[PDB]
Write a protein that binds this DNA or RNA. Structure first.
Length: 70
RNA sequence: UUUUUUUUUUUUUUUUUUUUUUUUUUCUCCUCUUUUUUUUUUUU
């Protein structure tokens, strides 16, 4: 009840989205997951082999932003 | 040696109809105390 009060009072929504707001999703399905279309591999410039990327991140960091490389 | 007569289960069937959830009261009402109101910053 207190958490609900804190939400309602401070103007924050707790409603999951609607069908048309859901349906517009990238399809990360097991029968066909996501993988880069090769014309965009052309158009970009890969570095997954010639350079090292890693990250320290807080405990529980289910979603990383920060990365660097020197 | 004991004849003859004294009715019985109401008659009738071939009449028209153009609405509609509910329904009808109760008054004015003293919110107690460190504050201006804090605020960059970074790790989600």
């Amino acid at each position: 009840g207190e958490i609900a009060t804190i939400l309602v009072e401070n103007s924050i929504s707790v409603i999951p989205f609607s069908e048309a707001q859901m349906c517009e999703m990238p399809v990360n399905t097991p029968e066909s997951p996501w993988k880069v279309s090769p014309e965009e591999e052309q158009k970009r410039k890969d570095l997954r082999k010639s350079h090292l990327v890693f990250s320290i991140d807080p405990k529980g960091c289910e979603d990383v932003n920060d990365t660097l490389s020197v």
